[PDB]
Design a protein around this nucleic acid. Structure first.
Lengths: 48, 49
RNA sequence: UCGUUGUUUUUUUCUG
């Protein structure tokens, strides 16, 4: 949940993303990306 | 006084570590968001470790 | 109209 990875506040209004948030979002993007290779040209080297 | 005393002027210099800059107490107050524990630092009503 | 909240991250020079 957010508690484990709370959103820091660099200066009042602007809140930065905890490293865990960036990492989870990146893993989510990559997972979506793998899900998108199979539907098109996936020449066994993009996949790898 | 039954004994005598060494006595004279000497060069003494004050130092930056005034007491009021170190005294501190905390009954309750701000807590770290992540851990819900008292914050660190005298200037923020920190808590002793 | 009680209520009423104030950053992290490093590095530094210091104190016992």
């Amino acid at each position: 949940p957010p508690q484990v990875r709370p959103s820091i506040a660099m200066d009042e209004t602007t809140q930065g993303q905890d490293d865990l948030t960036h990492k989870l979002s990146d893993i989510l993007k990559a997972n979506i990306n793998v899900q998108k290779l199979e539907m098109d040209g996936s020449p066994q080297h993009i996949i790898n | 006084l039954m004994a005598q005393v060494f006595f004279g002027p000497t060069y003494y210099q004050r130092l930056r570590h005034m007491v009021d800059d170190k005294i501190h107490a905390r009954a309750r107050g701000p807590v770290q968001v992540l851990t819900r524990q008292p914050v660190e630092g005298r200037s923020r009503d920190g808590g002793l470790r």
